[PDB]
Design a protein around this ligand. Sequence first.
Ligand SMILES: Nc1nc2c(ncn2[C@@H]2O[C@@H]3COP(=O)(O)O[C@H]3[C@H]2O)c(=O)[nH]1
Ligand SMILES: Nc1nc2c(ncn2[C@@H]2O[C@@H]3COP(=O)(O)O[C@H]3[C@H]2O)c(=O)[nH]1
Ligand SMILES: Nc1nc2c(ncn2[C@@H]2O[C@@H]3COP(=O)(O)O[C@H]3[C@H]2O)c(=O)[nH]1
Ligand SMILES: Nc1nc2c(ncn2[C@@H]2O[C@@H]3COP(=O)(O)O[C@H]3[C@H]2O)c(=O)[nH]1
Ligand SMILES: [Ca+2]
Ligand SMILES: [Ca+2]
Lengths: 450, 450, 450, 450
Amino acid sequence: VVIDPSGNTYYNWLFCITLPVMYNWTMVIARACFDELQSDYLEYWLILDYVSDIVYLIDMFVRTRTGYLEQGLLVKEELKLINKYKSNLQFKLDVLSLIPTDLLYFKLGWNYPEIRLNRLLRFSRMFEFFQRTETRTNYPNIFRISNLVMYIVIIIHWNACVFYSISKAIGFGNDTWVYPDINDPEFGRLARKYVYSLYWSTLTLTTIGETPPPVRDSEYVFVVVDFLIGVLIFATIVGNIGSMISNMNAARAEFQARIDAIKQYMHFRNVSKDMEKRVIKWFDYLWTNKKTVDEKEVLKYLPDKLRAEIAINVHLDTLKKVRIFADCEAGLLVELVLKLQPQVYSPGDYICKKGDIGREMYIIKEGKLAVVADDGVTQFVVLSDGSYFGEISILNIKGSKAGNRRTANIKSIGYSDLFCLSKDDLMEALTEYPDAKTMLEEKGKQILMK
Amino acid sequence: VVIDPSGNTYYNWLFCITLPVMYNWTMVIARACFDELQSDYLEYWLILDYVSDIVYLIDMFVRTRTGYLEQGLLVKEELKLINKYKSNLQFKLDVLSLIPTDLLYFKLGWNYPEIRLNRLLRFSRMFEFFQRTETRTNYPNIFRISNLVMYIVIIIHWNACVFYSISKAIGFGNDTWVYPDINDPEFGRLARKYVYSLYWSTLTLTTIGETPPPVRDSEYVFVVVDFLIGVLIFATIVGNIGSMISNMNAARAEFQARIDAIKQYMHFRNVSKDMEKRVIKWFDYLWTNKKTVDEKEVLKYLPDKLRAEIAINVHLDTLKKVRIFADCEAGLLVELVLKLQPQVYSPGDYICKKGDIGREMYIIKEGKLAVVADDGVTQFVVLSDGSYFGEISILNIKGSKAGNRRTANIKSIGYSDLFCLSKDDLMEALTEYPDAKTMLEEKGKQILMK
Amino acid sequence: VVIDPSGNTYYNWLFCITLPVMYNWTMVIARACFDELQSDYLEYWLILDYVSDIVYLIDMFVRTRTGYLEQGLLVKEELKLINKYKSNLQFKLDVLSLIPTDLLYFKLGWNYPEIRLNRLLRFSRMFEFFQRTETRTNYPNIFRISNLVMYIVIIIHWNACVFYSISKAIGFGNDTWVYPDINDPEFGRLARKYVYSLYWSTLTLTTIGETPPPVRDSEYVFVVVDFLIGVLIFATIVGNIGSMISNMNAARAEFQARIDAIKQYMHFRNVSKDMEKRVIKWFDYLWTNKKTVDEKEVLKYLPDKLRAEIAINVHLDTLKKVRIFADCEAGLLVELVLKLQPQVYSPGDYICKKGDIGREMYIIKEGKLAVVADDGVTQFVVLSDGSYFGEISILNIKGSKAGNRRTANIKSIGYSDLFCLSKDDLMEALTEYPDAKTMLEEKGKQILMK
Amino acid sequence: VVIDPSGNTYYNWLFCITLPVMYNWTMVIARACFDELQSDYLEYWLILDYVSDIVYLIDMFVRTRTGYLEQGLLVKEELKLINKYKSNLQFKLDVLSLIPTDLLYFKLGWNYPEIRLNRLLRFSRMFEFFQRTETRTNYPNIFRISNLVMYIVIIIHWNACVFYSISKAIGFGNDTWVYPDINDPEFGRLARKYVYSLYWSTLTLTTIGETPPPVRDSEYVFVVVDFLIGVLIFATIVGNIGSMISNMNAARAEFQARIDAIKQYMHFRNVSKDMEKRVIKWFDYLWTNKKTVDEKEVLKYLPDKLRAEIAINVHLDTLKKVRIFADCEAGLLVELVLKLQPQVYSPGDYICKKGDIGREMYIIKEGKLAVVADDGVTQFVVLSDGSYFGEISILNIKGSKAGNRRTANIKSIGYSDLFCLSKDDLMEALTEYPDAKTMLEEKGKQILMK
Ligand SMILES: Nc1nc2c(ncn2[C@@H]2O[C@@H]3COP(=O)(O)O[C@H]3[C@H]2O)c(=O)[nH]1
Ligand SMILES: Nc1nc2c(ncn2[C@@H]2O[C@@H]3COP(=O)(O)O[C@H]3[C@H]2O)c(=O)[nH]1
Ligand SMILES: Nc1nc2c(ncn2[C@@H]2O[C@@H]3COP(=O)(O)O[C@H]3[C@H]2O)c(=O)[nH]1
Ligand SMILES: Nc1nc2c(ncn2[C@@H]2O[C@@H]3COP(=O)(O)O[C@H]3[C@H]2O)c(=O)[nH]1
Ligand SMILES: [Ca+2]
Ligand SMILES: [Ca+2]
């Protein structure tokens, strides 16, 4: 065997089947409308159509060999897959899109390729590929815009073909509206035919209108309907363009809107230009160093038993340098990684101060912190990455003259990325295995006596 | 009896009255402006107008026979309904729209059907039908787009009629702007008249402008006002189109935006392509198997005493296979169905692990789980649908060497849809009837000894 | 005083000063550009300009006599108000807009009314009136759309005047682009002048372009700049139109989106058409009876000491029929009115059932409820409006064989609007005055014995 | 060293390098396409190009001398900065944009300035400056709109240059579509050349289309592609304009939407016009006095150890007049400034009333309050700014006949801005230093006895 739709093989086949479906959606109508296209390159159209039909057949086979999830397990029983396929509307659409209507080439002649129009009924495969690509691609907005542009181009191409067909029905050159006479040297070339039809279609759907006005009632009606199709469908698609660009700007726009609200508040309250500059510097840091997004709000949509792995694969850089995690229990790190709230501190920010509520443990992910003196400048100890502080005031200790108080003040030399671990959480998670707690308050007593 | 507006009969009548109202809103102005329309098909217009008026009268009768809610009860007293009708502005509008202005046909002649313009004053019924359909239809966006297209078409039709009337007032063919001379063979046909007027209207309201420029001051003024009506009203309607397409994409766009934020985080943090593929697979599963929507956020707008029924009608498939619910008390299932949080687990995800906080009971809705050994591969027990686990570590038990600990580790073979029932909730809800609890810890002791 | 800007007198004056400001913003540029406008109606323009200037002077006086809030109190000291006025930029703008530039009529002649262009510098007053109207009017969206249309019209009018002025500078009729020769009988009329200039302006700003193309470099540059002004500013304004219509649809669109999510869930889960019809009926009820909006989310932006008055003025209809409130303490009703959560129940919905957690007291605002038998049909007692139930299981009672249990089952005959009062809240709020509690458990014992 | 990108020097250099990048992005294509531009002002183009290249070199030097943050510290080691630069793609782009392609002037002649097209590869610097300006400027929306207008102008300019180049390739005047013959006196001027090309570009990108239709297939194709570029890219940019105006209106629109929901509720519930006027007055006050924004929601994105400084720099005006803060401990004010919830009370609003739950302490930021008698009018004490009340009922006091009760009723004479400090918070924060608490209940006893 089976293909496992989640796999890469299924996605690759989705591409390989979208190619014929897109080809069919573009060219069947073109060949049906522009007769010279069908006739001049008939030897190539036959090859391409037969290859497309072969790929359609192989796609039907793949649909027979693609497993589905019952009880969460991939069904691998062949006949079960055949039944699941045939019971779905997709099998009906596939049989309809693979009906050998090409036999009508013997009746209607080689000049009627619209018999292959049923081949469009595999559009679903194409759309599936798109909805898969949009999910799996690393450039979701580039692909989304390319998809919208493809839809625009297909719509304009189809409307060009429709215009040319209507000109044919009315008669080429019978009036100033229809496509001019084919017998003209310049206006008889297939290139000119298609490109002028596309020009007309673009002017009509984009509602520019710089085309000869209608002459007949059918022409007036078609032009009204087509200008309305233009207005509505092009507003739809080119406003989807707008929404895609909006969601492209979503993060940056939200960040900038927050900054603007802050600046409005500061200018209204006449906040000192010192503090205004400090705030602007904080936000410039958040942007430049790519910290505007908070991983919590993003990863909250992941499963906890997958977001856990995510956090581990991101923070194993530091949670191996820490003494508590991955050293004593070697598994405890998972119990708290999904609750280590990542904070960022500016240069000179006092994370801790003597005589404060010690309700948070900190793990230094990045940055240089200092166990300073209360004078403000004298740096007693420099804590680099992997260090952990703020854990002594969490625990119950014998001989602690300072209970629930910070034993020292910790300031940040530079921008520090820390993991604030709350006291309640450390309490709750160390209950399972105190084999790490013993050396934890080993460190605790050792630092509390000195 | 009375009609009970909530019923299907009332909605069917809403359709049957919207038909004449729509007919009146489309055709009265057309016949008033295009005199040949009124004259040539007068025998049909008379029949249709009289049928419309009869339906208007029957709609007034229905309004007299439609109950309203006082004290939440449907008023069935006839005279009370007559008073409620006559006291509402709707009765005034109905009498105004049913005034026999057709008598003016004897004074103004058969060439003045705008006397029936008062018939438009039942627009409310039409709109009511729409606002009912949008609520009750299964295709809300299809109907909404059809409604907007109907508004566009009606506006363009009315503007075409207005253009033709203005041409008539100025005189057909008196200058290049107005509709050409009626005496022309081609430009005198009612078909050509209406269709060219519609063409002009479309070019003006869509602001394409490929029409002969005005000549007189009245023409310049009307064209300015009409181009502005075009800009404003068509932006309104065709931006409502945009918002409707947006809300069509709302679920998919939110899902894809979450996926994009996740992928941005993973690529920025250089998350391993293993875990990136796992996350993409999780999201592909959520989409393909239609799990992107969380029933909680959707059904939270339902009444609890209706959302309860909803959850029952959805989850009675599994809550009959469970041993606790619908078996001992047979009513307890409602006390917890509105708090069974549905979770989804990937293949191989450890739902439970030995030595963890047993604070959640799980009911396997769909999927195969395994009571494995801690080695990781040896599957002791396979739990299929209807099974419940994680309930032993919830309860107070005699002789439990493992208190508040998982007696075994449960992993998911495939994608498991479970119902996580919190410990606090099971505690709170079993307090009412311990007739099920006794066999609950029957199972508990039986599994805790073996 | 003083005038007290919050008062109605200040708003009326805002209108009376917006009239000259709007007049000045519309007509000064018109008279400056269309010389015939200035000249032909000079006797009227002089009167209107002098009246506008008098009103400007009276507006300056009002600004001297309008109090401001210092320490939250309206300043009534005259000289303090004069200082507050003169210290503001508004005084500078007012003196600039009232500078007697009309004296230049003696130097530049009566054909130069753009000397009155400084009169536009009172635009602020106009805008203030708008921002006041939008706040105080009952039709905020009608006024907002009218304001946007006024901006559109003013922009188009100004661009028409600019086009005519540029034609004058280049010379009327010197090329096909500029306004045609004034000496023409038809193209020399002030009506034709202004209306064709407005036509050109509309075609340019709405970017239709059906105007003679530029000839000179200045014309090309102006047309480029004006088409870009068109694109940008008209997108701005006519997209503000879109956002205004969106916020017009905001409530209805949110309601309908909730209904659509519900219907999607129900159709996906194959919810029985019984329950689907019940849900659709619930939502039809919510809409038809105007219950889609929840007063909590709306009134949460009001002050509690004003939202309290709001809730009182709305619910004094029923909280006078209740026995506890406005009867014993006569002031207790305010302590709980801001926490009476309004619920709606469908016909047949069991609000209470025997043997359930009695943690909510209910006050029947509207609707008929029944104290039924557990059989389901036998109605023991019918509770109409003003009745209160679910209070016995809240209180501590002697001789209650049923503790924390519902003494009877309450069902809703029809759609009941109730006030669910939580047990914790009744406990917390009755602590202040048990003078009502005594008769409360009077009723309690009386019903618990029978 | 180093430059410290957060500093003002780096931003100034960002401007000084954006000037050549913008110059290059505007003029290289212009000179490449309009040959007369390159030739006539070659002496000036050479100077400007060499100055631009010198500034590019100095920008490369700056990039070598700009520190980056490792461990949150600004790297000042020269060679480390050289490595960080050369290891980034920016160094590749800078070397590519500074390659001396001007040497090709000796081969291709002075008429080929597109060899300087590589100079566009420093676009990043320009964009960086923009993203810095948008952050640091006080007019974020003005700058954003200016940036979008710059993008529009650059796109139109580039498309004008492209049109002129295509006309050159096809041949000037070979058909009606291309730019006319250069040999024409009027259509040969560089001014006319560029300005008509810009006119064509504006008509095409804004999709007005009032230009001669294409003649050749290449012209038709280019016009189709360019009209589509117009539609898509101009919708993008001029809808970004819409979103920028939306976020300009965001605060005012949210405020007005809240007011509209309130007014809809009040008119639907038939709220008395007294209370409707009171609510409208409250909202008029909120707007006029600039209180629609709540500093909590804005400043919650700031760091707590920066939002603290913000609140201090804003509220030190009053927290120096208070007796508790900045007087006894002199540091306690920071422990509670981030939890002082700012409330606003209308004139006559009873903040406190005798016999109520004293769970909030109030600090009068602005406004006159009264310790009144319960009669309602007799004002015992007038509390101005700096005063604090509601603190007696917070504390545990000996001899308090009124426990957890308000000792008096406090009403607001005028609009009072207060700081509501919750009881729990005062309890929690005074635990650290009771040196202020002693005089706190000094005041407490002193007022409780009298
Ligand atoms: N007092 C003290 N604290 C230190 C030293 N080195 C690291 N620390 C950390 O500084 C922290 C300050 O807050 P805590 O008292 O909670 O915990 C303290 C220790 O974790 C040291 O040498 N002396
Ligand atoms: N230990 C054990 N647990 C089982 C077995 N079969 C099912 N389970 C479930 O596995 C669950 C693991 O978590 P709990 O200990 O809370 O509850 C356990 C039982 O509900 C079994 O055979 N042995
Ligand atoms: N048992 C009983 N309850 C009644 C009667 N009339 C009204 N009620 C209300 O029905 C309510 C059901 O819930 P509670 O027991 O909390 O409170 C009960 C009473 O408030 C009655 O006649 N008998
Ligand atoms: N009773 C009384 N209260 C006063 C007086 N002056 C100020 N107050 C304040 O009024 C407040 C009312 O609420 P509290 O009793 O909590 O605290 C009271 C005091 O803080 C006074 O003279 N008498
Ligand atoms: Ca257009
Ligand atoms: Ca046009």
